[PDB]
Amino acid sequence: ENRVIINVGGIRHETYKATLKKIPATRLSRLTEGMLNYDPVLNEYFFDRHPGVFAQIINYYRSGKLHYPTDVCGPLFEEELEFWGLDSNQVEPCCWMTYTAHR
Amino acid sequence: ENRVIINVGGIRHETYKATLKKIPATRLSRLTEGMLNYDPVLNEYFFDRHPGVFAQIINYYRSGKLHYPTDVCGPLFEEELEFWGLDSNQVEPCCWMTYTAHR
Amino acid sequence: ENRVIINVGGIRHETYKATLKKIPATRLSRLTEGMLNYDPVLNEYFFDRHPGVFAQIINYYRSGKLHYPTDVCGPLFEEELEFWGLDSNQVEPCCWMTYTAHR
Amino acid sequence: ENRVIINVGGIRHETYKATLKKIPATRLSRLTEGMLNYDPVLNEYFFDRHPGVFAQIINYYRSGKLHYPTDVCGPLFEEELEFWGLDSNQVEPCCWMTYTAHR
Ligand SMILES: [Zn+2]
Ligand SMILES: [Zn+2]
Ligand SMILES: [Zn+2]
Ligand SMILES: [Zn+2]
Incomplete structure (x- = not known):
């Protein structure tokens, strides 16, 4: 009803639809039943x-x-x-050591 | 019967009801079927x-x-x-290095 | 048939029965349907x-x-x-650094 | 249809059949229903x-x-x-520190 199932690689993650709208202009905030990877039977999105x-x-x-x-x-x-x-770039201050280590 | 299912983000964790009472005055020790995020059909709590x-x-x-x-x-x-x-603050001595690293 | 499901905290791990016999005198090598935490309906052991x-x-x-x-x-x-x-004590040489760090 | 379920130790990983063909001459690129660990009922491969x-x-x-x-x-x-x-040997440059640490 107010939740969505995102089947990512077999693992069915679940969250409220509103949670996905928290970050606009992203793949998850854009989910739609018109998407081909959406299954009407199981009612989920496969990625x-x-x-x-x-x-x-x-x-x-x-x-x-x-x-x-x-x-x-x-x-x-x-x-x-x-x-x-x-x-x-939005990475938190606490996660800089693990972010810059690479570059 | 003596177990409860806590569906956390899609993953259905399972434990004995008694286990949750081990730490009083917490969200988990307070679980009740009056809660709206409780589903009587699947018999579980979604978080x-x-x-x-x-x-x-x-x-x-x-x-x-x-x-x-x-x-x-x-x-x-x-x-x-x-x-x-x-x-x-209840963190174990063995987990201090990972606790203080942040502050 | 030749496999067993060990429901550990909600997660249904699965392995061949023979695998569990590889380390004798352990809780897993001792699994039996006489155990109370064994469910005949779902056919699994809950831990x-x-x-x-x-x-x-x-x-x-x-x-x-x-x-x-x-x-x-x-x-x-x-x-x-x-x-x-x-x-x-059976810990592998490669996992000594993570083993002795504690004591 | 265009996806396959690889039940690895109880966890049902899911991917598109085409993904597995991306690395030829490997166990996964070789999956076949003639395999004994393939279940026609659940339609999956157990490892x-x-x-x-x-x-x-x-x-x-x-x-x-x-x-x-x-x-x-x-x-x-x-x-x-x-x-x-x-x-x-195909390990990425970013994963060398975790690769050579052992030998
Ligand atoms: Zn962080
Ligand atoms: Zn610890
Ligand atoms: Zn090791
Ligand atoms: Zn890497």
Whole structure:
């Protein structure tokens, strides 16, 4: 009703529709049933991306803050940030050490 | 019967009801079917939080000890600690290096 | 048929029955339908433990080698090692730095 | 239809069939219904491997780049790389520090 299921690589992440609108002009804030990767039977959106890193991607919408995970390298996370349409420059002060280590 | 399902961000964590009572005056020790985010059909509680960090949150109840995860930054974990009503000061000696690094 | 489902904290881990026999005299090598936490309907064993760390616990049986995870502290992992009846002294050379850091 | 479910240790990872063909001559690029670990009822392939590390294994196919996870040791990951038929020498520049630390 007020929730959406984003099946990312098999893992069915779930959140309120309103949460996804918190960051406008991104792939998630743009979800629509006209999308081909939307299944009307299961009522979900399938994305062939890293399911582990997605919790971190989705946490940006939930908390309004961008943190970097520390179980994967910055480059892998940033690839995910680019696919989802998020900006890495928004990274929190606490996640600078894990952000600059790469460049 | 003696277990409860806490659907945190799509991930259905499961524990015994008694485990949640181990830390009184917290959001989890307060679960009730009167709550709106409780679904009588699936018989579960939905919370729009980081599903990965929750295992760590729930492990505090299971073991009676507060450890910090090391796959996310202290600040992100602490945000979760605040939502769940847990106190970070209870952090174990072994998790001080990951606790003070931030402040 | 030749597989068993160990529902650890909500997460249904699955392995071949033979894998669990690889380390005799442990809680997992001892699984039996006489156990109360065994559900004949779903055909699974429920354990109220850390679901994330379990993959590491189960990987000891699968690979025959004991590695320590690096997304949680040694103490938390060791608590799990004790519950499951595994011996930390078997830790691999590659996981000594994460093993001795604590003591 | 255009997707496949790889049940790795209980966790049902999902991807497009085409993604698996991106790295020829590997176990995943070779999946076939003639395989005994393929279940026609559930329509999936079961592999008794580390379910956590698999997201990293599968991310190599998705992104075309090999990164090492940092929540487990290099040796454990490499064991998985060998089972899946992937080559560790392809490791990205950003994941050298976590690759050479071991040898
Ligand atoms: Zn941070
Ligand atoms: Zn600790
Ligand atoms: Zn190791
Ligand atoms: Zn990398």
